[PDB]
Amino acid sequence: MANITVFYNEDFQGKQVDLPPGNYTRAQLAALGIENNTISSVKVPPGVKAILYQNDGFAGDQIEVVANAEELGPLNNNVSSIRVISVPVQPRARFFYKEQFDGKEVDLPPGQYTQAELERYGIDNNTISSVKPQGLAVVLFKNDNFSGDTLPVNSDAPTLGAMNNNTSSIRIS
Ligand SMILES: [Ca+2]
Ligand SMILES: [Ca+2]
């Protein structure tokens, strides 16, 4: 079983609400109570992929996630339509906050990421640090689109903090 859990305030903070998978709009939500600008943050575990839609009727800027979205995105100022569909379970990785696995963690499924969603998809510009792959290998790229120097994390690294300069793009192999 699965269920996406949103948050009322940004930063994963603010009252939360669990919503079962499937496709719905402001209609179903009207039945619950939450609607419009409220999904400030999001926590979606693996096994199921979620897709948000700003304007109702599944329209307006759309988002896609499978893990826990911290900052969510820029359109967090308006939400109502969403769509989630069961997805095959796959391993992933885990990044901590404070330098020394002493800060909230964030997971990210396999795949590549840029410098825009990545940050606003799990953490932010600079704040990752200590990393810990829960199954696959993580690779950090300094410059944008996986370019410039790189820090291939082919193993556990509960302590990186001051190392490069600012992880821009990444790739979980
Ligand atoms: Ca925010
Ligand atoms: Ca350290």
mmCIF file of C-alpha atoms and ligand atoms in Angstrom, residues 10-11 40 70-72 76, ligand 1:
data_model
loop_
_atom_site.group_PDB
_atom_site.id
_atom_site.type_symbol
_atom_site.label_atom_id
_atom_site.label_comp_id
_atom_site.label_asym_id
_atom_site.label_seq_id
_atom_site.Cartn_x
_atom_site.Cartn_y
_atom_site.Cartn_z
ATOM 1 C CA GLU A 10 7.385 24.889 3.590
ATOM 2 C CA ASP A 11 10.466 23.078 4.808
ATOM 3 C CA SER A 40 3.811 23.358 0.657
ATOM 4 C CA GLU A 70 11.334 19.519 0.384
ATOM 5 C CA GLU A 71 10.886 22.890 -1.285
ATOM 6 C CA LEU A 72 8.462 21.266 -3.729
ATOM 7 C CA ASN A 76 3.763 25.835 -4.534
HETATM 8 CA CA CA B 1 10.435 27.036 0.663
#
